[PDB]
């Protein structure tokens, strides 16, 4: 079975360990080819992704998700390049983030479906790569154009199997909502990963989302500001619990029967323009191994807490190939 | 004092009739180049804008100024293409619409300044590709961010010479407010033009920007959605009032002595995907000229009215060439 990427297909053999929720550059549509020089330059944001995924990639890393839909300004040129400098796959995705422009937010869920399909089946803009994975996300209490944004992802897997991965922002739980209207639509569970849900320390909620099969996304472990009590803008973005606390929490439901159900990442990137100026450096400064930091630290960690190598292998190359791989019917 | 274009740099005097407000294509950025079908495709879209300017091109429009921003989808390869296919000047905009991404909204007005000379100063994209105007678009009051925009707008014309075109939503007013912040910063009101100003009635609010020196933009003519009562989209983008009633404006202007200060267009354009599915069926069904509406029916409704033709070539004409020729 095959798993598109942005240098094309490949075998569910070759996927490897993967990080199954990062970004290269967090920006919008567009901003990247207009103003290139909010990164110092094209050329250095691609050196700096390169050097970070050769980082990765030294720990072991095979693959990476990049989960920047359209709004979140997803360049799969730019993927496509740093992808074969660095020799690490990278599988772009299609979706709706937190940021869609009017041409986005103004359509039906008729529309948005085929939006989707194009982006899966027929390839993104005029490059022929196709995504790999529909990331949506919604705020508080789903939107009503969010829930549009949920249906169409659904539709889009179920005609396609490509999986779905979306998080909650504002809000620590939230994965009841989506879960309830992917549901409503037919999806399986197997197919969608409640991702950021390393945010909440409520074990009961993501326990009982993995016992209805849902992957559960441990996905922003490094993110803390921490230390940075002088930061009101690195708080409000990161959070203030350690990323031990966080690592815990994948213990926990191994611990609870679900080691299947974990998917974990580091949401890291290597340019951002979306929230305020020069938030890259604070975010370097907090995690300085960027997407070497689940190999680097993450992992050590578990198994210094006795986790073994087998189910630790089982979460980071098992479960994303299982997760990534194109599934029509559960 | 030459002004660039999306073919390259021109002379005042190869600018000719000039429709001072327009765009190819009402989008997002990114939008056409992830989602072409939306538009039937490119190909299509670039055949019908053709087609259009074509036709204005031979009621005698020489220029068109297409105000749209990077986030109103302003993709200059697709004005490039349409330039040289119809060939018919297009200035290029750069500046902030009412639809920022994270990336532009979360700028500061150092930063907004920087944004606006680099598509002024060096080019658009990778294309070379020069903006010749600066656009920048208001919600009733002016918010803060939309402060930022006006005073980066401000410094950018400054340091540049290019003038800025302004809106306000809806059918509001705000030349006031926008006015003050402008001049606040030190630019001249002969570098700015009001855009939108046919939206109201009011004579009085008109007239004395007019004396102030600022440009009146008298640039939605043919848009009305009387016979359309029963589509309220259609009514929220186009209002209640008539062409003729907007193209009485430019001949109450006129009589008050401040031809010079006007500046007309059309605010078409060819493809949209901002606003409801298939709006552009229902603009089409209402002005079925696109931009040749100002000179086949604005004009000589004018001249009807008793304008002298010379009059309507210094507004055509005239007006466009000094407000667009970049100053210091
Ligand atoms: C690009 As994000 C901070 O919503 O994971
Ligand atoms: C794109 As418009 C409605 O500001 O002319
Ligand atoms: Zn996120
Ligand atoms: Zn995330
Ligand atoms: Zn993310
Ligand atoms: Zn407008
Ligand atoms: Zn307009
Ligand atoms: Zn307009």
Not at 13 to 23: I, P
Not at 284 to 299: E, K, T, W
């Amino acid at each position: 079975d095959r798993i598109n990427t942005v240098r094309g297909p490949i075998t569910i053999s070759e996927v490897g360990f993967t990080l199954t929720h990062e970004h290269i550059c967090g920006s919008s549509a567009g901003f990247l080819r207009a103003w290139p020089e909010f990164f110092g330059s094209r050329e250095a944001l691609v050196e700096k992704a390169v050097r970070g995924l050769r980082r990765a990639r030294a720990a072991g890393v095979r693959t990476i998700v990049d989960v920047s839909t359209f709004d979140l300004g997803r360049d799969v040129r730019l993927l496509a390049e740093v992808s074969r400098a660095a020799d690490v796959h990278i599988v772009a995705a299609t979706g709706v983030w937190l940021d869609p422009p009017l041409s986005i937010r103004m359509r039906s869920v008729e529309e948005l479906t085929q939006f989707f399909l194009r982006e899966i089946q027929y390839g993104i803009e005029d490059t022929g790569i196709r995504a790999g994975i529909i990331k949506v996300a919604i705020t508080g209490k789903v939107t009503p154009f969010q829930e549009l944004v949920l249906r169409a992802a659904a539709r889009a897997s179920l005609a396609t199997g490509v999986p779905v991965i979306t998080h909650t922002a504002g809000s620590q739980r939230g994965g009841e909502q989506q879960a309830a209207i992917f549901e409503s639509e037919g999806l399986s569970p197997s197919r969608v990963c409640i991702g950021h849900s390393d945010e909440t320390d409520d074990l009961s909620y993501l326990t009982a989302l993995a016992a209805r099969g849902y992957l559960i996304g441990l996905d922003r472990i490094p993110h803390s500001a921490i230390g940075l009590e002088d930061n009101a803008s690195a708080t409000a973005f990161m959070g203030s619990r350690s990323w031990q606390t966080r690592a815990l929490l994948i213990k926990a439901l191994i611990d609870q029967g679900y080691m299947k159900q974990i998917l974990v990442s580091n949401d890291w990137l290597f340019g951002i323009s979306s929230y305020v100026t020069n938030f890259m450096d604070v975010m370097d400064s907090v995690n300085p191994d960027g997407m070497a930091f689940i190999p680097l630290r993450v992992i050590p960690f578990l198994r210094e807490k006795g986790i073994p190598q087998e189910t630790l292998a089982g979460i980071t190359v098992t479960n994303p190939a299982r997760f990534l791989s194109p599934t029509l019917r559960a």
